DNA sequence: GCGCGTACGTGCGTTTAAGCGGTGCTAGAGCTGTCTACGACCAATTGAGCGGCCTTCGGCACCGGGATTCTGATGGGCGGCCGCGTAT
């Protein structure tokens, strides 16, 4: 049949996590995927840009790390890094 | 439109610090050179994800049955009708 994949499974549990027996319209659901896919290119594209400025050829986590910092304002940014840094840190701990 | 008020432009003198070209020093960019770890690629197996399809309980707002309260015809008894009516 057709494809047209989306992030619907990811957005839904997140909302469950923050009000479990709280609801949503089928119109705000796409707004959400539209919103995510939009932020996706915003961050990953910028990573691509720096990589081939100061003369290197792969994109790691550090770059995102840097990228994120100047893409967003002071207070959210730090918490965001923190969360980000740990999630992965744990990831490696396992293996 | 008009009129009041005052603040901001234009000037001079005083004053303060940029810009100039002079030297010295070393830090940090840029180059360079070897290793090897981590990502792309190709393979084969496996279940997360998408289309397709129809689920069940709880909550908003309309509802249900039974005792109880208020309105209506009924009725004997004390009074009043003054006006037609029979008896001597």
PDB file of C-alpha atoms (C1' of nucleotides) in Angstrom:
ATOM      1  CA  UNK A   1       0.000   0.000   0.000  1.00  0.00           C
ATOM      2  CA  UNK A   2       1.187   3.601   0.702  1.00  0.00           C
ATOM      3  CA  UNK A   3       3.840   4.710   3.273  1.00  0.00           C
ATOM      4  CA  UNK A   4       3.560   8.323   4.605  1.00  0.00           C
ATOM      5  CA  UNK A   5       5.292   7.439   7.937  1.00  0.00           C
ATOM      6  CA  UNK A   6       5.167   9.824  10.920  1.00  0.00           C
ATOM      7  CA  UNK A   7       6.301  10.204  14.539  1.00  0.00           C
ATOM      8  CA  UNK A   8       2.814   9.485  15.978  1.00  0.00           C
ATOM      9  CA  UNK A   9       3.980   6.660  18.331  1.00  0.00           C
ATOM     10  CA  UNK A  10       6.688   8.913  19.939  1.00  0.00           C
ATOM     11  CA  UNK A  11       4.470  12.042  20.510  1.00  0.00           C
ATOM     12  CA  UNK A  12       1.628   9.948  22.056  1.00  0.00           C
ATOM     13  CA  UNK A  13       3.605   8.236  24.849  1.00  0.00           C
ATOM     14  CA  UNK A  14       5.207  11.589  25.694  1.00  0.00           C
ATOM     15  CA  UNK A  15       1.749  13.061  26.291  1.00  0.00           C
ATOM     16  CA  UNK A  16       0.822   9.929  28.277  1.00  0.00           C
ATOM     17  CA  UNK A  17       3.907  10.632  30.358  1.00  0.00           C
ATOM     18  CA  UNK A  18       2.588  14.139  31.168  1.00  0.00           C
ATOM     19  CA  UNK A  19      -1.172  13.675  31.588  1.00  0.00           C
ATOM     20  CA  UNK A  20      -2.100   9.980  31.149  1.00  0.00           C
ATOM     21  CA  UNK A  21      -5.886  10.263  30.912  1.00  0.00           C
ATOM     22  CA  UNK A  22      -5.719  13.532  28.944  1.00  0.00           C
ATOM     23  CA  UNK A  23      -6.693  13.795  25.239  1.00  0.00           C
ATOM     24  CA  UNK A  24      -5.853  15.219  21.800  1.00  0.00           C
ATOM     25  CA  UNK A  25      -7.477  16.016  18.423  1.00  0.00           C
ATOM     26  CA  UNK A  26      -6.376  14.391  15.129  1.00  0.00           C
ATOM     27  CA  UNK A  27      -5.570  17.962  13.914  1.00  0.00           C
ATOM     28  CA  UNK A  28      -3.018  18.793  16.674  1.00  0.00           C
ATOM     29  CA  UNK A  29      -1.367  15.425  16.050  1.00  0.00           C
ATOM     30  CA  UNK A  30      -0.082  16.372  12.629  1.00  0.00           C
ATOM     31  CA  UNK A  31       0.835  19.866  13.858  1.00  0.00           C
ATOM     32  CA  UNK A  32       3.106  17.919  16.208  1.00  0.00           C
ATOM     33  CA  UNK A  33       4.848  15.770  13.567  1.00  0.00           C
ATOM     34  CA  UNK A  34       5.053  18.828  11.308  1.00  0.00           C
ATOM     35  CA  UNK A  35       6.751  20.526  14.247  1.00  0.00           C
ATOM     36  CA  UNK A  36       9.257  17.743  14.971  1.00  0.00           C
ATOM     37  CA  UNK A  37      10.281  17.145  11.358  1.00  0.00           C
ATOM     38  CA  UNK A  38      10.834  20.920  11.149  1.00  0.00           C
ATOM     39  CA  UNK A  39      13.120  20.977  14.148  1.00  0.00           C
ATOM     40  CA  UNK A  40      14.871  17.843  12.788  1.00  0.00           C
ATOM     41  CA  UNK A  41      16.263  19.546   9.618  1.00  0.00           C
ATOM     42  CA  UNK A  42      16.959  22.773  11.621  1.00  0.00           C
ATOM     43  CA  UNK A  43      19.452  20.971  13.952  1.00  0.00           C
ATOM     44  CA  UNK A  44      20.952  18.236  11.627  1.00  0.00           C
ATOM     45  CA  UNK A  45      21.525  20.663   8.733  1.00  0.00           C
ATOM     46  CA  UNK A  46      23.468  23.074  10.992  1.00  0.00           C
ATOM     47  CA  UNK A  47      25.621  20.163  12.100  1.00  0.00           C
ATOM     48  CA  UNK A  48      26.415  19.477   8.477  1.00  0.00           C
ATOM     49  CA  UNK A  49      27.477  23.127   8.014  1.00  0.00           C
ATOM     50  CA  UNK A  50      30.071  23.287  10.822  1.00  0.00           C
ATOM     51  CA  UNK A  51      31.561  19.884   9.900  1.00  0.00           C
ATOM     52  CA  UNK A  52      32.786  21.193   6.511  1.00  0.00           C
ATOM     53  CA  UNK A  53      33.833  24.595   7.822  1.00  0.00           C
ATOM     54  CA  UNK A  54      36.663  23.924  10.174  1.00  0.00           C
ATOM     55  CA  UNK A  55      37.664  21.120   7.767  1.00  0.00           C
ATOM     56  CA  UNK A  56      36.309  17.771   8.893  1.00  0.00           C
ATOM     57  CA  UNK A  57      34.232  15.120   7.386  1.00  0.00           C
ATOM     58  CA  UNK A  58      31.957  13.310   9.831  1.00  0.00           C
ATOM     59  CA  UNK A  59      29.200  14.565  12.153  1.00  0.00           C
ATOM     60  CA  UNK A  60      29.329  13.381  15.775  1.00  0.00           C
ATOM     61  CA  UNK A  61      27.366  14.191  18.918  1.00  0.00           C
ATOM     62  CA  UNK A  62      29.750  16.964  19.982  1.00  0.00           C
ATOM     63  CA  UNK A  63      28.728  19.079  17.060  1.00  0.00           C
ATOM     64  CA  UNK A  64      25.023  18.704  17.813  1.00  0.00           C
ATOM     65  CA  UNK A  65      26.099  19.546  21.289  1.00  0.00           C
ATOM     66  CA  UNK A  66      27.660  22.823  20.157  1.00  0.00           C
ATOM     67  CA  UNK A  67      24.910  23.459  17.680  1.00  0.00           C
ATOM     68  CA  UNK A  68      22.220  23.184  20.140  1.00  0.00           C
ATOM     69  CA  UNK A  69      23.838  25.723  22.447  1.00  0.00           C
ATOM     70  CA  UNK A  70      23.544  28.724  20.120  1.00  0.00           C
ATOM     71  CA  UNK A  71      20.251  27.522  18.476  1.00  0.00           C
ATOM     72  CA  UNK A  72      18.370  28.092  21.741  1.00  0.00           C
ATOM     73  CA  UNK A  73      18.237  30.633  24.649  1.00  0.00           C
ATOM     74  CA  UNK A  74      20.109  30.400  28.023  1.00  0.00           C
ATOM     75  CA  UNK A  75      17.910  28.502  30.501  1.00  0.00           C
ATOM     76  CA  UNK A  76      16.357  25.781  28.341  1.00  0.00           C
ATOM     77  CA  UNK A  77      19.636  25.177  26.640  1.00  0.00           C
ATOM     78  CA  UNK A  78      21.583  24.083  29.706  1.00  0.00           C
ATOM     79  CA  UNK A  79      18.918  21.673  30.919  1.00  0.00           C
ATOM     80  CA  UNK A  80      18.593  20.398  27.407  1.00  0.00           C
ATOM     81  CA  UNK A  81      22.352  19.707  27.143  1.00  0.00           C
ATOM     82  CA  UNK A  82      22.354  18.081  30.569  1.00  0.00           C
ATOM     83  CA  UNK A  83      19.581  15.693  29.665  1.00  0.00           C
ATOM     84  CA  UNK A  84      21.248  15.058  26.350  1.00  0.00           C
ATOM     85  CA  UNK A  85      24.710  14.398  27.739  1.00  0.00           C
ATOM     86  CA  UNK A  86      23.487  11.942  30.405  1.00  0.00           C
ATOM     87  CA  UNK A  87      21.115   9.935  28.193  1.00  0.00           C
ATOM     88  CA  UNK A  88      24.079   9.022  25.984  1.00  0.00           C
ATOM     89  CA  UNK A  89      26.513   8.686  28.838  1.00  0.00           C
ATOM     90  CA  UNK A  90      24.241   5.989  30.283  1.00  0.00           C
ATOM     91  CA  UNK A  91      23.936   4.460  26.831  1.00  0.00           C
ATOM     92  CA  UNK A  92      27.695   3.869  26.715  1.00  0.00           C
ATOM     93  CA  UNK A  93      27.865   2.659  30.329  1.00  0.00           C
ATOM     94  CA  UNK A  94      25.795  -0.268  29.031  1.00  0.00           C
ATOM     95  CA  UNK A  95      27.336  -2.192  26.087  1.00  0.00           C
TER      96      UNK A  95
ATOM     97  C1'  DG B   1      -5.128  76.064  14.106  1.00  0.00           C
ATOM     98  C1'  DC B   2      -2.806  78.094  17.479  1.00  0.00           C
ATOM     99  C1'  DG B   3      -0.188  78.993  21.287  1.00  0.00           C
ATOM    100  C1'  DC B   4       3.017  77.773  25.264  1.00  0.00           C
ATOM    101  C1'  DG B   5       6.962  75.793  26.674  1.00  0.00           C
ATOM    102  C1'  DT B   6      11.118  73.985  26.688  1.00  0.00           C
ATOM    103  C1'  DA B   7      14.448  70.815  24.998  1.00  0.00           C
ATOM    104  C1'  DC B   8      17.708  69.945  21.745  1.00  0.00           C
ATOM    105  C1'  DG B   9      20.981  72.101  17.906  1.00  0.00           C
ATOM    106  C1'  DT B  10      24.853  75.046  17.208  1.00  0.00           C
ATOM    107  C1'  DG B  11      29.033  77.311  19.076  1.00  0.00           C
ATOM    108  C1'  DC B  12      33.671  77.775  21.815  1.00  0.00           C
ATOM    109  C1'  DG B  13      36.472  76.638  24.878  1.00  0.00           C
ATOM    110  C1'  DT B  14      38.415  73.099  27.756  1.00  0.00           C
ATOM    111  C1'  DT B  15      39.885  68.359  27.972  1.00  0.00           C
ATOM    112  C1'  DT B  16      40.516  63.861  27.409  1.00  0.00           C
ATOM    113  C1'  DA B  17      41.951  59.494  24.659  1.00  0.00           C
ATOM    114  C1'  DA B  18      41.915  57.666  19.895  1.00  0.00           C
ATOM    115  C1'  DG B  19      44.841  56.844  16.194  1.00  0.00           C
ATOM    116  C1'  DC B  20      49.844  56.463  14.490  1.00  0.00           C
ATOM    117  C1'  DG B  21      53.697  53.876  13.470  1.00  0.00           C
ATOM    118  C1'  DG B  22      57.800  51.468  16.734  1.00  0.00           C
ATOM    119  C1'  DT B  23      59.272  47.412  19.108  1.00  0.00           C
ATOM    120  C1'  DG B  24      58.962  42.984  21.653  1.00  0.00           C
ATOM    121  C1'  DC B  25      57.122  38.538  22.901  1.00  0.00           C
ATOM    122  C1'  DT B  26      55.109  34.340  22.750  1.00  0.00           C
ATOM    123  C1'  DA B  27      50.592  31.848  21.946  1.00  0.00           C
ATOM    124  C1'  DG B  28      47.879  29.862  19.519  1.00  0.00           C
ATOM    125  C1'  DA B  29      46.563  28.609  14.436  1.00  0.00           C
ATOM    126  C1'  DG B  30      48.268  25.761  10.687  1.00  0.00           C
ATOM    127  C1'  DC B  31      50.903  22.515   9.038  1.00  0.00           C
ATOM    128  C1'  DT B  32      52.491  17.929   9.069  1.00  0.00           C
ATOM    129  C1'  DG B  33      52.888  12.904  10.020  1.00  0.00           C
ATOM    130  C1'  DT B  34      51.795   8.412  11.643  1.00  0.00           C
ATOM    131  C1'  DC B  35      47.591   4.669  14.011  1.00  0.00           C
ATOM    132  C1'  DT B  36      43.776   3.057  14.286  1.00  0.00           C
ATOM    133  C1'  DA B  37      39.150   3.333  15.763  1.00  0.00           C
ATOM    134  C1'  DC B  38      34.361   3.843  13.860  1.00  0.00           C
ATOM    135  C1'  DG B  39      31.339   4.294   9.869  1.00  0.00           C
ATOM    136  C1'  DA B  40      30.000   2.750   5.543  1.00  0.00           C
ATOM    137  C1'  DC B  41      28.511  -1.662   3.020  1.00  0.00           C
ATOM    138  C1'  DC B  42      26.595  -6.231   2.150  1.00  0.00           C
ATOM    139  C1'  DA B  43      24.274 -10.112   4.340  1.00  0.00           C
ATOM    140  C1'  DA B  44      19.931 -12.590   6.751  1.00  0.00           C
ATOM    141  C1'  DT B  45      16.728 -12.651  10.462  1.00  0.00           C
ATOM    142  C1'  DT B  46      13.322 -10.485  13.139  1.00  0.00           C
ATOM    143  C1'  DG B  47       9.322  -7.233  15.275  1.00  0.00           C
ATOM    144  C1'  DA B  48       8.253  -2.416  15.348  1.00  0.00           C
ATOM    145  C1'  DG B  49       5.362   0.332  12.651  1.00  0.00           C
ATOM    146  C1'  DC B  50       1.412   1.458   9.414  1.00  0.00           C
ATOM    147  C1'  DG B  51      -3.210   0.736   7.347  1.00  0.00           C
ATOM    148  C1'  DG B  52      -7.688  -1.189   8.386  1.00  0.00           C
ATOM    149  C1'  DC B  53     -10.930  -1.663  11.207  1.00  0.00           C
ATOM    150  C1'  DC B  54     -14.168  -1.245  14.885  1.00  0.00           C
ATOM    151  C1'  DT B  55     -14.272  -0.958  21.484  1.00  0.00           C
ATOM    152  C1'  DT B  56     -16.066  -0.068  26.056  1.00  0.00           C
ATOM    153  C1'  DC B  57     -16.904   2.605  30.170  1.00  0.00           C
ATOM    154  C1'  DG B  58     -17.741   7.173  32.084  1.00  0.00           C
ATOM    155  C1'  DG B  59     -19.655  11.853  31.998  1.00  0.00           C
ATOM    156  C1'  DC B  60     -22.861  15.691  30.388  1.00  0.00           C
ATOM    157  C1'  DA B  61     -27.663  16.434  30.408  1.00  0.00           C
ATOM    158  C1'  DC B  62     -31.645  15.214  29.734  1.00  0.00           C
ATOM    159  C1'  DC B  63     -35.395  12.131  33.178  1.00  0.00           C
ATOM    160  C1'  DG B  64     -38.730   8.814  36.544  1.00  0.00           C
ATOM    161  C1'  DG B  65     -41.948   7.306  40.389  1.00  0.00           C
ATOM    162  C1'  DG B  66     -44.265   8.214  44.731  1.00  0.00           C
ATOM    163  C1'  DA B  67     -46.184  10.773  48.716  1.00  0.00           C
ATOM    164  C1'  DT B  68     -48.121  15.248  49.580  1.00  0.00           C
ATOM    165  C1'  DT B  69     -50.264  19.917  49.134  1.00  0.00           C
ATOM    166  C1'  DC B  70     -53.927  23.054  47.182  1.00  0.00           C
ATOM    167  C1'  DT B  71     -58.114  23.890  44.624  1.00  0.00           C
ATOM    168  C1'  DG B  72     -63.378  22.717  43.733  1.00  0.00           C
ATOM    169  C1'  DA B  73     -68.548  20.950  44.369  1.00  0.00           C
ATOM    170  C1'  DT B  74     -71.330  19.566  48.486  1.00  0.00           C
ATOM    171  C1'  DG B  75     -74.665  20.374  52.523  1.00  0.00           C
ATOM    172  C1'  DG B  76     -77.293  20.775  57.066  1.00  0.00           C
ATOM    173  C1'  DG B  77     -78.932  25.013  59.733  1.00  0.00           C
ATOM    174  C1'  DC B  78     -79.955  29.829  61.096  1.00  0.00           C
ATOM    175  C1'  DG B  79     -81.794  33.868  58.693  1.00  0.00           C
ATOM    176  C1'  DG B  80     -84.047  36.666  55.676  1.00  0.00           C
ATOM    177  C1'  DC B  81     -87.380  37.412  50.878  1.00  0.00           C
ATOM    178  C1'  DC B  82     -91.433  41.058  51.471  1.00  0.00           C
ATOM    179  C1'  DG B  83     -95.283  39.289  48.619  1.00  0.00           C
ATOM    180  C1'  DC B  84     -99.236  36.211  46.940  1.00  0.00           C
ATOM    181  C1'  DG B  85    -102.803  33.743  49.562  1.00  0.00           C
ATOM    182  C1'  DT B  86    -106.593  31.414  52.209  1.00  0.00           C
ATOM    183  C1'  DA B  87    -110.007  32.061  56.328  1.00  0.00           C
ATOM    184  C1'  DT B  88    -113.296  34.586  59.235  1.00  0.00           C
TER     185       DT B  88
END
